[PDB]
Amino acid sequence: WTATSGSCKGRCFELQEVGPPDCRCDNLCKSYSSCCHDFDELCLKTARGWECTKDRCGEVRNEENACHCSEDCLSRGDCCTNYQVVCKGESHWVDDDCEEIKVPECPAGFVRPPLIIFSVDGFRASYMKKGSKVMPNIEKLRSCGTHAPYMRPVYPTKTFPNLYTLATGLYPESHGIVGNSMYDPVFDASFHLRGREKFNHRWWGGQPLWITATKQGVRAGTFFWSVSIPHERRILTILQWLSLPDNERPSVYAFYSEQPDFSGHKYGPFGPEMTNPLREIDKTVGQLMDGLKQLRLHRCVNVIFVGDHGMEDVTCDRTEFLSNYLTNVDDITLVPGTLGRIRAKSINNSKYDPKTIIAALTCKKPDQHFKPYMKQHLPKRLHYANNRRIEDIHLLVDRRWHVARKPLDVYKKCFFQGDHGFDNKVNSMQTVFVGYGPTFKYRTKVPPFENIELYNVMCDLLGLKPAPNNGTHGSLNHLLRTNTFRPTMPDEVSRPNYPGIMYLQSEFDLGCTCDDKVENKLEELNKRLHTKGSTKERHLLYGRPAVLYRTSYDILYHTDFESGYSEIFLMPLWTSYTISKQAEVSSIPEHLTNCVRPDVRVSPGFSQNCLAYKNDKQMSYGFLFPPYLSSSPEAKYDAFLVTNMVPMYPAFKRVWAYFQRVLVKKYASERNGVNVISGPIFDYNYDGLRDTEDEIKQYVEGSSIPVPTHYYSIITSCLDFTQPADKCDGPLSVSSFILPHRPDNDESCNSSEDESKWVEELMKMHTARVRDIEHLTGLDFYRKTSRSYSEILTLKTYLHTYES
Numbered sequence: 059w060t061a062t063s064g065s066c067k068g069r070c071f072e073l074q075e076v077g078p079p080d081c082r083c084d085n086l087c088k089s090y091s092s093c094c095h096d097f098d099e100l101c102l103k104t105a106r107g108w109e110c111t112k113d114r115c116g117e118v119r120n121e122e123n124a125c126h127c128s129e130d131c132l133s134r135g136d137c138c139t140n141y142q143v144v145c146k147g148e149s150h151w152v153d154d155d156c157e158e159i160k161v162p163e164c165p166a167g168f169v170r171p172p173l174i175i176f177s178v179d180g181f182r183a184s185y186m187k188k189g190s191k192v193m194p195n196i197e198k199l200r201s202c203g204t205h206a207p208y209m210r211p212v213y214p215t216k217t218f219p220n221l222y223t224l225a226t227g228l229y230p231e232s233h234g235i236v237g238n239s240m241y242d243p244v245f246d247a248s249f250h251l252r253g254r255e256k257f258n259h260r261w262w263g264g265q266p267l268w269i270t271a272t273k274q275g276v277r278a279g280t281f282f283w284s285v286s287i288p289h290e291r292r293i294l295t296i297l298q299w300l301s302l303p304d305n306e307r308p309s310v311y312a313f314y315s316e317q318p319d320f321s322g323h324k325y326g327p328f329g330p331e332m333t334n335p336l337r338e339i340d341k342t343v344g345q346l347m348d349g350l351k352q353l354r355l356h357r358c359v360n361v362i363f364v365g366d367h368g369m370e371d372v373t374c375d376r377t378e379f380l381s382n383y384l385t386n387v388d389d390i391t392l393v394p395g396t397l398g399r400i401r402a403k404s405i406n407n408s409k410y411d412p413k414t415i416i417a418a419l420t421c422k423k424p425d426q427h428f429k430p431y432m433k434q435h436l437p438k439r440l441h442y443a444n445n446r447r448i449e450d451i452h453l454l455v456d457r458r459w460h461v462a463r464k465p466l467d468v469y470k471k472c473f474f475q476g477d478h479g480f481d482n483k484v485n486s487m488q489t490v491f492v493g494y495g496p497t498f499k500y501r502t503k504v505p506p507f508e509n510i511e512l513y514n515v516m517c518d519l520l521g522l523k524p525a526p527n528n529g530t531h532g533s534l535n536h537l538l539r540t541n542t543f544r545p546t547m548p549d550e551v552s553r554p555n556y557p558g559i560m561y562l563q564s565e566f567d568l569g570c571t572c573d574d575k576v577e578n579k580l581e582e583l584n585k586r587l588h589t590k591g592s593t594k595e596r597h598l599l600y601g602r603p604a605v606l607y608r609t610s611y612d613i614l615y616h617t618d619f620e621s622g623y624s625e626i627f628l629m630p631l632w633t634s635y636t637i638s639k640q641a642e643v644s645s646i647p648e649h650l651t652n653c654v655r656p657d658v659r660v661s662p663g664f665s666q667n668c669l670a671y672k673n674d675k676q677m678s679y680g681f682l683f684p685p686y687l688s689s690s691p692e693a694k695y696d697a698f699l700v701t702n703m704v705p706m707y708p709a710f711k712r713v714w715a716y717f718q719r720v721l722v723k724k725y726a727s728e729r730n731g732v733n734v735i736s737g738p739i740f741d742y743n744y745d746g747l748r749d750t751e752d753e754i755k756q757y758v759e760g761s762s763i764p765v766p767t768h769y770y771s772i773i774t775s776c777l778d779f780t781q782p783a784d785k786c787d788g789p790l791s792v793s794s795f796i797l798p799h800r801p802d803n804d805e806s807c808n809s810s811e812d813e814s815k816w817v818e819e820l821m822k823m824h825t826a827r828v829r830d831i832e833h834l835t836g837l838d839f840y841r842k843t844s845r846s847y848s849e850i851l852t853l854k855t856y857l858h859t860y861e862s
């Protein structure tokens with residue numbers, strides 16, 4: 059029940075929310091069906107349209123018009139946005155040359171430059187170029203303001219997850235909105251676009267911008283708009299608010315457009331029918347910019363033009379059906395579309411085995427347009443596992459395709475030519491960012507960045523302290539003219555030990571043997587220098603990584619590589635080495651094939667043993683620094699130290715060996731040398747953060763040797779490739795991956811072929827930001843360079859995507 063007997067008289071679009079049973083007059087009243095009887099009459103006026111005409115100039119004020127052209131309209135703050143052009147001979151904002159806004163030019167009583175978020179749904183990145191001819195206002199913002207070529211959304215590239223990430227700086231796994239449709243097993247409730255469940259606050263975690271603003275005494279206009287409120291009324295309402303008295307006027311505003319998404323689904327991303335919605339958005343932007351110019355605010359307000367995701371060509375006939383794969387199709391629930399999520403149909407079924415489901419969906423058709431994953435096995439860059447609303451089984455769907463359960467679901471539940479939701483590295487899914495105003499830079503192009511970073515920036519633009527989020531604060535300082543946040547390196551928590559030679563061979567009982575007895579004052583003093591770290595400025599090019607948690611570890615120096623060896627985890631946390639362009643690949647000589655040597659710097663008690671690997675029939679081992687890249691036959695013996703060794707499934711060894719033997723050399727040739735840092739990751743609880751010692755779920759049988767869930771490498775070189783990696787004077791270039799450490803190669807359908815047909819493709823899929831590895835290891839890289847910290851944070855958030 060709601061007693062909607064009150065009035066909206068003088069309450070049109072009120073900023074405080076009144077409670078039951080009194081009727082409401084805010085921009086959300088409709089969605090709650092709680093509006094006052096006269097809401098439409100008083101607040102949603104349409105009479106005479108949205109533009110002033112020549113005859114209307116200096117008219118008498120009729121209060122039933124949608125906007126006014128009367129003399130007192132500027133005072134009342136409700137002129138039609140084109141009033142000054144038609145009636146006062148002023149120019150449109152678009153027709154003015156753009157002049158740099160060096161200082162905020164704000165009216166009196168304005169404590170800070172206001173922020174207006176102009177969000178556009180499904181606004182694919184490539185529209186900025188391909189529609190430029192029909193979007194003159196947007197093109198002005200772009201060329202005069204600060205813009206990226208594109209901005210990367212979060213996965214899934216859906217509306218609700220992405221709009222709420224924009225508002226929170228959080229991954230969906232963290233804010234809780236993991237899809238447009240969700241089932242929470244603890245609530246036993248479903249979230250849908252249609253229905254009232256989506257309104258309960260229990261679905262929405264994190265702290266969105268408008269809550270952050272309020273808690274810190276910065277007033278917010280209501281972000282969300284009802285579908286039946288025309289865009290013109292949305293602009294006027296925002297311009298009205300900007301006319302409110304100082305003590306009432308919000309500092310942050312949001313506008314939202316359901317276009318071009320709406321048309322995109324119908325007509326595809328580039329349908330000839332797409333020109334008009336693009337024309338319209340631009341006109342809406344023109345109205346805001348003209349309106350701001352009236353209020354003398356067009357050189358005071360910061361405007362963000364931002365999209366949630368792009369749009370892909372998708373049709374009914376491009377649907378994969380699970381019924382073509384499974385026998386028991388009725389014992390599963392599927393969340394369908396541009397992504398698949400599978401769970402049991404009955405919540406407590408004993409004989410439900412996701413293993414057989416996965417197996418039934420794996421490389422079963424030569425042409426398969428999706429791939430099944432256990433969620434912990436999804437690429438770590440997606441950050442899509444750590445929420446109870448994310449089903450254990452996931453299907454990553456090929457761009458342009460859909461997955462459905464049965465054919466009846468598609469024909470009894472084609473009308474559409476467009477859709478979105480795919481892997482967030484997909485080109486068609488990229489969306490837009492433009493910043494314009496006093497605080498943004500002037501005519502500045504920035505590199506592409508991820509939408510998780512904007513919350514920090516919007517907090518900065520408003521003088522707010524951001525809630526804890528997934529952005530890297532300071533990585534987008536280069537978008538801004540004036541920065542309110544100076545980022546600083548975190549302090550190292552653990553300092554390393556620097557052990558010398560302390561143990562004799564016979565003290566070790568590791569079950570390891572090596573044929574190393576085959577054997578001068580000059581070259582014996584030379585190799586001592588190597589163990590002292592004489593060649594360390596060659597193999598450790600950016601300083602030692604800092605350990606940001608409490609642990610016990612040793613720095614080990616060698617001729618060819620340096621390592622941070624953990625006495626807790628019995629293996630290195632990191633291994634650092636430089637491979638120059640000139641460097642050569644050799645093989646493991648025949649006598650050294652099974653060679654594992656004790657490390658006389660490290661105690662038997664803090665070492666791995668070979669016996670455990672002998673007994674554990676599932677688990678073999680590999681080496682972090684590759685024997686194949688030793689600089690001399692004598693230095694190769696270093697690669698076989700027990701302290702360079704890590705547990706590896708034979709299946710994974712195929713991937714790793716190809717990386718170490720072939721790919722590193724290829725990268726060094728293409729990039730003019732590379733520095734490589736490699737190591738283990740332990741994330742058994744799939745939360746994207748390093749596991750503590752007491753959270754390890756797997757050991758090499760009958761040992762205390764923990765098995766990594768993943769192996770990473772960070773591969774750095776000079777951005778100016780005319781310079782070698784180890785003598786770089788400028789900006790850096792980086793690519794990284796986090797490989798899942800899996801007992802099989804079921805992910806790569808071509809794995810029975812030679813490693814050259816599949817391994818690199820798998821690595822590309824598991825591309826990663828340096829920052830992802832940091833979360834997962836508790837380490838902090840690039841501590842010693844000649845580059846500014848902001849530039850280094852930008853470098854750390856970089857993702858090499860491999861898209862063309």
Ligand SMILES: *[C@@H]1O[C@H](CO)[C@@H](O[C@@H]2O[C@H](CO)[C@@H](O[C@@H]3O[C@H](CO[C@H]4O[C@H](CO)[C@@H](O)[C@H](O[C@H]5O[C@H](CO)[C@@H](O)[C@H](O)[C@@H]5O[C@H]5O[C@H](CO)[C@@H](O)[C@H](O)[C@@H]5O)[C@@H]4O)[C@@H](O)[C@H](O)[C@@H]3O)[C@H](O)[C@H]2NC(C)=O)[C@H](O)[C@H]1NC(C)=O
Nearest residue numbers: 231232233234262263264444445446526527528745746833
């Ligand atoms: C991305 O950035 C976020 C934010 O910094 C990081 O997430 C934080 O991680 C830490 C460490 O694991 C968590 O702290 C622990 O949690 C609890 C306290 O938790 C409560 O209090 C906070 C503070 O107000 C609140 O945000 C939490 O809200 C969670 O739970 C709600 C339901 O109960 C839910 O509506 C909401 O979405 C959120 O759920 C998410 O986090 C929980 C874990 O807390 C997780 O189970 C779930 O799947 C969701 O992902 C909650 O009421 C303490 O008792 C512990 O001691 C410990 O300190 C933070 O809670 C957590 N913050 C948020 C907002 O999630 C991510 O780690 C980071 N990711 C990466 C990859 O870097």
Ligand SMILES: O=C(/C=C/c1ccc(OC(F)(F)F)cc1)N1CC[C@@H]2CN(C(=O)c3ccc4[nH]nnc4c3)C[C@@H]2CC1
Nearest residue numbers: 175177179217221222224225251281282283312313314319
């Ligand atoms: O009013 C807002 C935004 C406020 C905002 C504005 C800015 C913003 O960013 C921030 F926070 F940073 F300012 C966040 C939210 N709405 C957006 C949310 C939903 C989306 N929706 C759909 O029907 C819909 C659209 C596309 C689809 N494709 N497939 N299914 C789809 C379903 C109904 C509702 C409209 C209201």
Ligand SMILES: [Ca+2]
Nearest residue numbers: 179180217366
């Ligand atoms: Ca959307």
Ligand SMILES: [Ca+2]
Nearest residue numbers: 741747748749
């Ligand atoms: Ca973890």
Ligand SMILES: [Cl-]
Nearest residue numbers: 709802803809
């Ligand atoms: Cl294999």
Ligand SMILES: [Cl-]
Nearest residue numbers: 609749750751
């Ligand atoms: Cl630990």
Ligand SMILES: [Zn+2]
Nearest residue numbers: 180217319478
């Ligand atoms: Zn959509």
